[PDB]
């Protein structure tokens, strides 16, 4: 063949949708053939493929439905040797892999009279953190507005929604520590780690420290509404420091992993 | 920024630096008090430090409320907490040596005077929400526990070994345009006695600001003549110079670290002085 | 290091005796300093970057100057970036002490990849620089009446006692103490070695005091040992270095057509163009110069991921889809020939991150 192609699908669980990306290139068989037969006399020839249809169709049984691409791709496109073209498609995801078909209708342009056409197609199967859980217990934590961007110094609010269904109520307390953690390594890594810790420690601060969450009766929820203020511009992806400890067995669950504050 | 001035402490500190624009915002610290009301009725707080006053804060029953009150850092150049005995308000008594050696009695003295500094200048007032004629006040002597090792550093820079200082010629240069930076390092009273040595090294490590990862020691973005790691003395004010040449558009941080020796571990102080520059 | 026997057979004019000695000296032919070049291109400005270093684990050295002399073939470029050391600059074998030396070259007409550049770095060995300090500041300091008597034993002192003093370079680096290693020299044996040769009692006494002082660790750190290098000839290492034999030179710029959440593409227009005109070799718009965008585990490409270059200025829209959370670098790009050739590419946006902010 002369369209060595593959499908490199990758899953986005955060977006809850898999991106199937096909990519096809003119192959070394074509690289040999262009010198062997097409223009043996001319020093360095080139192929002249023309794709007239690129189709991605999800199929099952008698069903066959096309799927549009992410970005505009001009259907009647050209292609020379040593070329590789990629396209992407999105589709929503648990125990039943999908079935897809890629169809490529094209035609060579050996001279503008002879146009050898092709309709090559093949089918296959689509084969291949934000909500935190508590250890030694059942409770679950999620910030309602996980990703928030604001300006420097403007106080902003979160909603730490809680699920509790274990056996009995709890009196967990949430707090932010603005203390530089102790480093455990070359200096080029030690000071990297310290810069991370210092920014975590004195970047964002909590206006409701030692906020005793009053009661969470069993099989019920709670909205631990928190309030913040930032003082150092940057991106606090999966911000640490904000940790919540339970006054039943002295847990230290890192509930702060569900937040992605961005203060400019 | 200028947009966030609705809040009182941010407005006050911005106004102070604007009115006295020679000092820099790193010469300030927050205090972050947290008033918890035990009285059944709601109370209104106004807190005050030397010149400014906070806006009214309505704290209700059994609910804590944090107060971000700013304080100017106290300089060790004109207070001399090192040799200043703790006062005995009942003079005349049999004296018993406390068995506290120099290295820790100096620490306890420093902590005590550091605490005593903010007591005399910080105050606040009441207004009960029900009846407005039940005003009062709060002493902080019998609330504020003794300071700790962490809190000494931030409010007392003299505890740190070196009072470094950085400056660029212009914080705006073109690609390939040369620019030199100077580091002014002066030791402190802590450095003058805490260690028996003569030389300490410092490194001029660089950060990308946006990406916030340290650039490699031998990078593709900043060019310089001579090693970043340099010696300095422990007894005289030292000036170091570097001849930075940026190559890539962006912004860089130029932090500093100071170490005993090139022995992997053993870094004296992880300094916070940094000056950001932009190349475009 | 090799041994070497010299012998003289010299006569004299005034005297008739055919004098001449036969000495057997060691020579350390191993070169102390080492230099590794690294090269940098950027549009129309070149950049040299030398990583000076030492080539012996237990012999730190000191740099004085490394001014890159330009070639003498023609009225060539305006170099800049010569380093003159105000004070000698230490340098070890390895560690976090990379003594970079950077140079900026900007052309006038064009580049020829056949010229040469001579570094001409002047250095000296820490052992020599710190042996001079002992043999001039501890023995014969501030005395001429002493030196006129001691000088008859000069060359013996600098060849049969001083040469074997192995040093604590680690101690000098850390605490700045001039101290010997414990298993350096048998004190009793070297103390005995001086008796056999005749010697003035005062000279024996003062040399004993000096050896005791050196073994006890005189530790002047920074108040001195910058004046005694004046009477030590340095050593030059004029080394040639040459620009690379690249055939072609492209540069590629990713214009951002028209922050950016996951799953929504960002349009871009790539502009590849061959700036080989200003590097001697004429442009060749017919070679096998495939240009490809290396998609990674944290980026995804849509459009033309690879294309053959056959024109001076190629461009084509390409769409970029993020996968990772935030603060990602651009995808790398490569241009490797198919037949046998090599070239170089200046990615203008090589180091420029983009913030991806989900939802």
UniProtKB/Swiss-Prot annotation, chain A:
<comment type="subunit">
    <text>Part of the multisubunit TRAPP (transport protein particle) II complex composed of BET3, BET5, TRS20, TRS23, TRS31, TRS33, TRS65, TRS120 and TRS130. Interacts directly with TRS120 and TRS130.</text>
</comment>
<comment type="function">
    <text>Specific subunit of the TRAPP II complex, a highly conserved vesicle tethering complex that functions in the late Golgi as a guanine nucleotide exchanger (GEF) for the Golgi YPT1 GTPase. TRS65 plays a role in the YPT GEF activity of TRAPP II in concert with the two other TRAPP II-specific subunits TRS120 and TRS130. Involved in cell wall (1--&gt;6)-beta-glucan synthesis.</text>
</comment>
<protein>
    <recommendedName>
        <fullName>Trafficking protein particle complex II-specific subunit 65</fullName>
    </recommendedName>
</protein>
UniProtKB/Swiss-Prot annotation, chain B:
<protein>
    <recommendedName>
        <fullName>Trafficking protein particle complex II-specific subunit 120</fullName>
    </recommendedName>
</protein>
<comment type="function">
    <text>Specific subunit of the TRAPP II complex, a highly conserved vesicle tethering complex that functions in the late Golgi as a guanine nucleotide exchanger (GEF) for the Golgi YPT1 GTPase. TRS120 plays a role in the YPT GEF activity of TRAPP II in concert with the two other TRAPP II-specific subunits TRS65 and TRS130.</text>
</comment>
<comment type="similarity">
    <text>Belongs to the TRS120 family.</text>
</comment>
<comment type="subunit">
    <text>Part of the multisubunit TRAPP (transport protein particle) II complex composed of BET3, BET5, TRS20, TRS23, TRS31, TRS33, TRS65, TRS120 and TRS130. Interacts directly with TRS65.</text>
</comment>
Curated annotation (Swiss-Prot), chain C:
<protein>
    <recommendedName>
        <fullName>Trafficking protein particle complex II-specific subunit 130</fullName>
    </recommendedName>
</protein>
<comment type="subunit">
    <text>Part of the multisubunit TRAPP (transport protein particle) II complex composed of BET3, BET5, TRS20, TRS23, TRS31, TRS33, TRS65, TRS120 and TRS130. Interacts with YPT31 and YPT32.</text>
</comment>
<comment type="similarity">
    <text>Belongs to the TMEM1 family.</text>
</comment>
<comment type="function">
    <text>Specific subunit of the TRAPP II complex, a highly conserved vesicle tethering complex that functions in the late Golgi as a guanine nucleotide exchange factor (GEF) for the Golgi YPT1 GTPase. TRS130 plays a role in the YPT GEF activity of TRAPP II in concert with the two other TRAPP II-specific subunits TRS65 and TRS120. Required for both the cytoplasm-to-vacuole targeting (Cvt) pathway and starvation-induced autophagy through its role in ATG8 and ATG9 trafficking.</text>
</comment>
């Amino acid at each position: 063949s002369l369209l060595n192609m593959r499908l490199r699908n990758i899953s986005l669980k955060s977006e809850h949708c898999i991106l199937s990306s096909l990519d096809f290139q003119t192959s070394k068989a074509s690289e040999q053939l262009t010198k062997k037969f097409i223009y043996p006399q001319e020093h360095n020839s080139f192929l002249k493929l023309n794709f007239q249809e690129i189709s991605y169709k999800l199929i099952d049984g008698t069903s066959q439905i096309e799927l549009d691409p992410i970005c505009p791709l001009k259907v009647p496109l050209t292609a020379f040797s040593y070329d590789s073209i990629s396209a992407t498609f999105k589709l929503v995801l648990s125990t039943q892999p999908h079935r897809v078909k890629i169809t490529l209708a094209y035609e060579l342009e050996l001279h503008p009279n002879l146009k050898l056409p092709v309709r090559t197609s093949w089918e296959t199967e689509v084969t291949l953190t934000s909500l935190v859980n508590s250890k030694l217990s059942n409770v679950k934590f999620k910030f309602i507005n996980s990703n928030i961007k604001v300006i420097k110094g403007e106080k902003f609010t979160m909603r730490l929604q809680i699920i509790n269904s274990s056996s009995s109520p709890l009196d967990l307390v949430v707090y932010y520590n603005n203390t530089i953690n102790p480093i455990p390594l070359t200096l080029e890594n030690q000071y990297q780690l310290h810069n991370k810790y210092r920014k975590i420690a004195e970047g964002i601060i909590l206006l409701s420290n030692d906020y005793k969450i009053p009661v969470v009766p069993p099989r019920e929820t709670y909205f631990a509404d928190l309030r913040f203020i930032g003082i150092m511009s940057g991106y606090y992806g999966t911000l640490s420091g904000l940790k919540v400890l339970d006054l039943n067995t002295n847990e230290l669950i890192e509930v702060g992993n569900g937040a992605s504050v961005l203060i400019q | 920024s200028s947009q966030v001035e609705n809040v009182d402490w941010i407005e006050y500190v911005m106004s102070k630096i604007r009115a006295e624009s020679n000092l820099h915002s790193r010469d300030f610290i927050l205090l972050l008090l947290d008033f918890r009301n035990s009285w059944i009725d709601g109370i209104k707080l106004n807190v005050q430090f030397e010149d400014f006053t906070s806006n009214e804060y309505h704290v209700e029953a059994s609910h804590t409320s944090r107060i971000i009150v700013p304080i100017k850092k106290i300089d060790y150049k004109k207070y001399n907490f090192e040799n200043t005995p703790i006062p005995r308000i009942y003079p005349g008594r049999q004296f018993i040596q406390s068995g506290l050696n120099e290295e820790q009695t100096i620490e306890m003295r420093q902590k005590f005077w550091c605490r005593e500094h903010i007591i005399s200048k910080l105050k606040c007032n009441w207004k009960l929400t029900t009846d407005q004629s039940v005003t009062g006040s709060v002493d902080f002597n019998k609330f504020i526990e003794k300071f700790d090792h962490k809190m000494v550093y931030t409010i007392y820079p003299g505890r740190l070994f070196y009072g470094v200082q950085l400056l660029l010629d212009e914080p705006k240069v073109k690609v390939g345009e040369i620019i030199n930076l100077k580091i002014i390092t002066e030791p402190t009273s802590t450095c003058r006695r805490k260690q028996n040595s003569t030389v300490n090294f410092l490194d001029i490590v660089i950060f990308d600001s946006k990406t916030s990862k340290i650039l490699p020691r031998s990078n593709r973005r900043i060019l310089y003549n001579g090693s970043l790691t340099k010696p300095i003395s422990t007894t005289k004010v030292s000036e170091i110079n570097l001849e930075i040449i940026p190559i890539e558009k962006g912004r860089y941080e130029f932090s500093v670290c100071i170490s005993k020796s090139n022995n992997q571990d053993g870094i004296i102080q992880f300094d916070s002085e940094n000056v950001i520059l932009s190349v475009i | 290091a090799f041994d070497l026997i010299i012998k003289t057979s010299f006569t004299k004019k005034n005297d008739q005796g055919t004098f001449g000695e036969t000495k057997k000296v060691r020579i350390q032919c191993y070169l102390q300093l080492s230099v590794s070049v690294e090269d940098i291109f950027k549009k129309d400005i070149f950049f040299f970057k030398f990583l000076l270093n030492s080539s012996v684990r237990e012999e730190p050295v000191i740099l004085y100057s490394s001014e890159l002399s330009a070639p003498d073939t023609r009225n060539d470029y305006n170099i800049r970036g010569d380093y003159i050391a105000t004070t000698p600059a230490l340098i070890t074998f390895d560690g976090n002490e990379s003594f970079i030396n950077c140079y900026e070259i900007t052309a006038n007409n064009n580049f020829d990849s056949k010229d040469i550049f001579n570094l001409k770095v002047r250095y000296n060995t820490l052992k020599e620089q710190l042996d001079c300090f002992i043999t001039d500041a501890v023995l014969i300091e501030g005395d001429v009446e002493w030196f006129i008597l001691f000088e008859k034993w000069k060359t013996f002192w600098e060849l049969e006692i001083l040469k074997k003093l192995k040093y604590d370079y680690d101690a000098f680096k850390e605490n700045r103490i001039i101290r010997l290693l414990k298993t350096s020299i048998d004190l009793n044996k070297t103390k005995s070695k001086i008796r056999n040769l005749c010697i003035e009692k005062a000279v024996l006494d003062k040399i004993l005091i000096c050896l005791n002082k050196v073994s006890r660790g005189i530790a002047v750190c920074n108040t001195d040992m910058d004046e005694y290098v004046r009477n030590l000839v340095p050593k030059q290492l004029t080394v040639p270095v040459q620009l690379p034999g690249f055939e072609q030179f492209f540069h590629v710029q990713f214009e951002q057509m028209e922050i950016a959440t996951i799953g929504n593409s960002l349009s871009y227009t790539v502009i590849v163009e061959n700036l080989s005109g200003q590097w001697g070799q004429d442009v060749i718009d017919d070679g096998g110069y495939i240009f490809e965008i290396l998609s990674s585990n944290e980026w995804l490409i849509h459009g033309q991921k690879r294309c053959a270059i056959k024109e001076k200025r190629k461009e084509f829209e390409v769409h970029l889809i993020p996968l990772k959370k935030g603060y990602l670098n651009f995808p790398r790009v490569e241009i490797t020939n198919i037949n046998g050739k090599s070239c170089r590419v200046d990615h203008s946006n090589a180091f420029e991150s983009i913030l991806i902010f989900a939802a």
